[PDB]
Design an enzyme around this catalytic site. Structure first.
Site, mmCIF file in Angstrom:
data_model
loop_
_atom_site.group_PDB
_atom_site.id
_atom_site.type_symbol
_atom_site.label_atom_id
_atom_site.label_comp_id
_atom_site.label_asym_id
_atom_site.label_seq_id
_atom_site.Cartn_x
_atom_site.Cartn_y
_atom_site.Cartn_z
ATOM 1 N N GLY E 199 2.251 0.853 5.578
ATOM 2 C CA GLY E 199 2.838 1.308 4.316
ATOM 3 C C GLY E 199 4.352 1.196 4.348
ATOM 4 C CD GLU E 225 6.346 7.237 -4.333
ATOM 5 O OE1 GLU E 225 5.722 7.393 -3.259
ATOM 6 O OE2 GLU E 225 5.939 6.500 -5.257
#
Lengths: 420, 141, 374, 420, 374
Positions: E199, E225
């Site tokens: 990721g 985020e």
């Protein structure tokens, strides 16, 4: 102002009653005296109704008497005025339409009145509100439930019509009063296609409406001494003669399409031509004619050689008077006038909407393409049960005669319809 | 109103030679002057003398020995829009406009010869003259 | 004063009030816009709007209709409607009066179109070629038409249907194709449609060759993709069975040389007029073709292809050119028309005015770009 | 008013004839006297034509004489006036363009005249109508068929050009007058790429136009003593050197892309670098340069080190003078001016439209991206026969020399073009 | 008085009439809009419109062009065109005069942009942050540029191509990745693109750790985020091989405790500056980064990710920040740039200004969110 009104229509309603006493029944059904905007007209309508309720004849004299006794004659303009009303009606038979106009304008006045009333209450009582909104709901609905609606047709009455239909379908004997079709079973019901009738044959593509019409046109011209006028707007004159040559002499269509022709299939062709040459078949393959052109050509033909039938290969291709919803209605109406003028049955093919598949065709399938339903005195649908090379001919409408399904067999190889 | 090419050509040339003695020397041999406009011949003379004494590229000191009547012109030209590095073709072009200006003026002598012929209806003569003038015009442009 | 007939108009509306049936024949011949006076326009519209509901048309229903759409007063009120209804002594001649109204309408349209074109001549100057094309189009669009009045008797069609199975035009050079057409008839517009690499251009050239070297007929070819040079290269390449790769890449064997001198002697005798100007207009085609016929002769006209010359106008204008020069016109297309022909390769025909509708089959040699018989 | 006219263009047409008698041929082809709006110009053009038809020289004197004899000299302004016309022409060679302007304005006047005439007839004759519409059709068409069109090139004449081409393709011997390409077969035809020529190499993506141009640039710089200027707008300088290192020393490209390098494939790399370092290769990998930048850089280079070729990796990436149809034409025109200035061949790669697949590339494939066709004195297409690792180089245009297909072989592994 | 040079303009148009070739160099340097006077603008446009047809440019063809588009009179008539043609003594210096016209044009644009920004300062009050960003952008958009004039000699590229196969920057902590970059160079803008769960965030954090705990370099991470808390949780989780599920769900075994005290002692020595403010602007990045360098030092800048900060402006503005702070900037993206790197997981690199373009391969442990060597 000014409040929605139609003095002209009010005058025609009262006038109608003075020309034909029967006009009062339709008028009283649609209107009460208070629908009339003009006081004199209310007083007059009320006098008529009173006379009528006594079972006494309603005419200029008894209405005059009635109003004189209620001291209202001079007030409404006297006998002279009742005279004017009598001269103010274009046609007594149109009284329902005049009545509806009066009613419409009355309903609007009530809409305006109650709406205003609600607005006023908004400024005054201020106060309650919840009651206000509810009565505002209530009062607005009341305006709609006022117009003359109904009635429901009762099942008993339809059962009678239903049974009387079944009577006609069996009571079917037996003389052919019109133009014989060549399909004896269709002739039983129709008798057959008659002069001045507008006949509409609707069917979805691939069902065989074109082949059906050609078979009929072919049977009429070769069997009877009558002339048939065929308008083919989607298909050329030779392309159409090809199909009736095949049908005539029993020649495989695809066989012709590919040159292939067995020695005797050729001898089959010469007999078809021989027999088909004596027939009175006139074809106009003009791509998108107007109705006036159709009409003019048929006109010249009947007085030049005589005419017996008109067949038009689908109506949705006829172009209007200009350069589609309203446009088709005028064409429909015009084709019916064409039938009446030349005292000849007019067969107009029609295409069906894609509703049949959304369910056996019915009236609503051409109703979205109307108002051909009204003008046609006979509407026929073609439906194939298996989409047994058998095809159904549903006669949904017939003005003089029964309603039912006649059945024929279709032969693909020759593009024909045969009896059963 | 815009100035004629030959005149612009003289002005620009002057504007350049006032800031470059390298160009002033080239114009002295190639052009008299020989400049077509009096004031330009006058300035030319004062520009030529500037080097034939010693002084180098300095439009400041030039506008101070010039006889005052010409000063306004020299002043104006020393501000004219010039990139102070003249191209090879530019000089040829400018000098050519100055050198054959007298030649365009020669035409007007024949122009009168033509119109007078024309006045006394001597048309073929007049046409012949005009035919010559076209050749002379081609000879210049 | 714009062409008009108030009297004709007045009789039409009047006739409708006198006998509601008169609306049907009038509605056939007229639309509201044909009436010169707005009042009459408004009235005739109201009249039609009621019939469509479909309610009876009379003074009351029409008055109510005009009033409902707030235009009773503008058309003169009930007075005027009554004036019109009271003036009319008959409704038997509605279509006579209707046709007068229609004519005046056409003439107004003629005038409006022409004035506009005249005005555009000053304002767009700037766009000459576009102006001339749209003026052609605009004038054409004034006139309909009509369809005189001739039913075809079956006897007459039968002969044409019989004779339509068992070479009266211009020979294509393909016997099997000459069967289906016999051959390329005068004034016909022939459309040959196809997909990438079949190939359309090769087919067009072959016919242009086989007509021009076998008949004393002159063909006019218009190529918009390849130059006249490339077009002739392909022709003599097919004419004498010469491998294209050898013409292009210099080196020719002596079979090719003798095979070449043969092909261009043979091709010199034609018969071939080429125009390879990129984007050409249909009218530019006409000018060059008219000047060619009148000076040399012709003809057959080959166009490659039609979407390089809105297609409807071009197509229609091509039919006029064919009919004008009394000569067949073959126009190619990439995937109103007289003959439609789509494309061992198969030639499928979808439309033919007089001939048989069927399918022919031809071979194609890749290396010579040539089509041959079976 | 005022009627479409161009007195200026009329004056330049007549003037041209007085400067060069040859100008009358193109003018008479395009115009008749009546196309001139001004009466004097009509009279003058007519005098010229008359003199010409007698086979007599058309100049100021004979036109003067002609007009004097027809009593029209003074009326047209005299000899003095013929003089003015002679001064009113910017360049006699541009006479066709002036002529076309006059013609255009004449055609417009006829459009206006006939249109007006139709409008007038609409009000008058009223009368006939059917004839009116037909003659209105007829008259409007007549306006178009007036302009000077044609002519068709005759097949005989093309056959001559065709045969003379085949002559040049075989008559091919043998000296390399320009810059040798390294591809002997391309050098036969070109001879090779010459100073001042604009060379356009167009090809669809994946065909190998970039590799082609690099091979040429590589051959010129390593083999001859000349400097090559390469503009790579889509590909970086290192990414491009990678491709010519592979090509040079015969190193498998994918092999380099993955680090893998056989011991001697490495020794292969050092010889490539050694030989490639001596070459005069100058690369500018600026993403989207304007032509002025290209021009300025090349300018400085030629006078700083000398210049022999310019290669530009595709032209559609060059950004215009502002911040695409008209824009590309100016760039094209500018590249040709670049070639002339630096007396050097300019090779501009071009991408082809997706038309080749809609059918071997031809001129019309870059014509939709023109007008590069006009500016280029040599246009080359690259076409692969199998989309045999052989690739075709179609020389579609060459101003001085033949037209044909030269053939080379492509080696994917090294990204090279080799002889045959 | 707006910056202009009527004289320069007049020479350019005049030069074109004197020698039609002069249009090419002028058309290279100028567009019609650059001329201050509409007349000249109109004229230069007409001039270009004729060349594009492509017809010769001269007094007649240009006059006819202006007249056709109804603007001969507005530009001063044939008088003016002749004045311009007669004034010009040469066309050798067209580009000198063209460049003067271009400059004045730029200055006008500069003035127009600045005035607009000044005016927006009063009218939009209301939108401060949007105003400052678009003012930056608007000013940048005034200046092009140019590309000085330096060809790269092959000798120079060859050395860089050789040395580009067989650790001069900041070490990533991944030896195989340090081979392809060696390592993360100053002023480089590095884009790392990826799809859901690979990721991206884990990769960014790993590099931020391996730089900060092994080198004395300070990294500035901007996470939009996840919070700084969640970001540090992942870092010490990977730092000391601790199972995330155990940190989250309270209960830690004593392997985890000792393993934890190890990871945060080790992580306390870095070197890590986090900013987890949701929607951040590029300039806010600069302010915090400039104040950090000038007070502490740095650097490397890690951004996660860029479509939470039209992307073209952000991207360009990021390159300026990298070049300003003389520090590498790695910006992640979800699926102008110096290095582009897409994502047993494979790191594909598509772009590198100086380094080798190839593919690297790394492992990924799911339970620690850590990337490791092979």
């Amino acid at each position: 102002r000014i409040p929605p009104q139609s003095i002209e229509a009010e005058q025609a309603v009262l006038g109608a009653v003075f020309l034909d006493p029967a006009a009062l029944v339709p008028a009283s059904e649609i209107l009460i005296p208070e629908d009339f905007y003009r006081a004199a007209h209310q007083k007059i309508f009320h006098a008529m109704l009173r006379v009528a309720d006594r079972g006494e004849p309603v005419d200029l004299v008894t209405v005059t008497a009635e109003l004189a006794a209620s001291e209202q004659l001079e007030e409404i303009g006297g006998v002279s005025y009742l005279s004017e009303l009598a001269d103010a009606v274009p046609t007594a038979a149109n009284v329902e339409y005049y009545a509806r106009i009066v009613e419409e304008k009355s309903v609007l006045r009530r809409l305006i009145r109650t709406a205003t009333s609600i607005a006023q209450d908004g400024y005054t009582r201020e106060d309650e509100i919840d009651v206000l909104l509810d009565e505002a709901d209530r009062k607005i609905m009341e305006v709609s439930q006022r117009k003359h609606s109904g009635a429901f047709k009762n099942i008993k009455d339809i059962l009678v019509q239903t049974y009387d239909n079944i009577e006609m379908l069996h009571n079917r004997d037996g003389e052919i009063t019109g133009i014989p079709t060549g399909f004896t079973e269709l002739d039983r019901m129709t008798s057959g296609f008659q002069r001045s009738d507008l006949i509409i044959v609707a069917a979805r593509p691939s069902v065989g409406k074109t082949a059906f019409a050609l078979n009929i046109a072919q049977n009429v011209a070769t069997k009877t001494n009558e002339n048939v006028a065929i308008f083919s707007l989607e298909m050329s004159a030779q392309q159409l003669v090809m199909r009736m040559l095949c049908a005539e002499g029993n020649i495989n269509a695809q066989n012709l399409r590919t040159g292939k022709l067995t020695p005797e299939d050729w001898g089959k062709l010469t007999m078809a031509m021989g027999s088909l040459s004596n027939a009175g078949i006139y074809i106009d393959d003009t791509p998108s004619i107007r109705v006036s052109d159709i009409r003019a050509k048929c006109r010249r033909l009947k007085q030049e050689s005589g005419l017996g039938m008109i067949v038009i290969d689908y109506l949705q291709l006829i172009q209007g008077s200009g350069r589609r919803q309203q446009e088709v209605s005028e064409i429909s109406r015009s084709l019916k006038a064409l039938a009446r003028e030349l005292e000849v049955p007019v067969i107009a093919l029609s295409q069906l909407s894609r509703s049949v598949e959304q369910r056996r065709p019915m009236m609503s399938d051409i109703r979205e393409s109307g108002s051909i339903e009204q003008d046609a005195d006979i509407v026929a649908f073609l439906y194939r049960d298996d989409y047994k090379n058998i095809i159904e001919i549903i006669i949904a409408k017939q003005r003089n005669g029964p309603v039912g399904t006649v059945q024929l067999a279709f032969i693909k190889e020759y593009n024909k319809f045969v009896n059963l | 109103k815009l100035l004629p090419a030959f005149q612009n050509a003289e002005r620009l040339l002057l504007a350049h030679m006032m800031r470059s003695r390298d160009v002033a020397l080239v114009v002295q041999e190639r052009i008299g002057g020989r400049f077509n406009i009096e004031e330009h011949r006058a300035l030319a003379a004062y520009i030529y003398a500037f080097y034939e004494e010693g002084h180098e590229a300095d439009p400041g000191a030039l506008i101070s020995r010039i006889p005052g009547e010409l000063q306004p012109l020299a002043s104006e030209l020393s501000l004219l829009l010039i990139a102070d590095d003249v191209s090879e073709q530019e000089l040829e072009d400018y000098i050519r406009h100055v050198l054959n200006r007298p030649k365009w003026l020669m035409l007007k002598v024949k122009e009168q010869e033509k119109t007078e012929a024309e006045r006394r209806k001597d048309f073929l003569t007049a046409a012949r003259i005009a035919k010559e003038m076209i050749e002379m015009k081609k000879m210049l442009s």
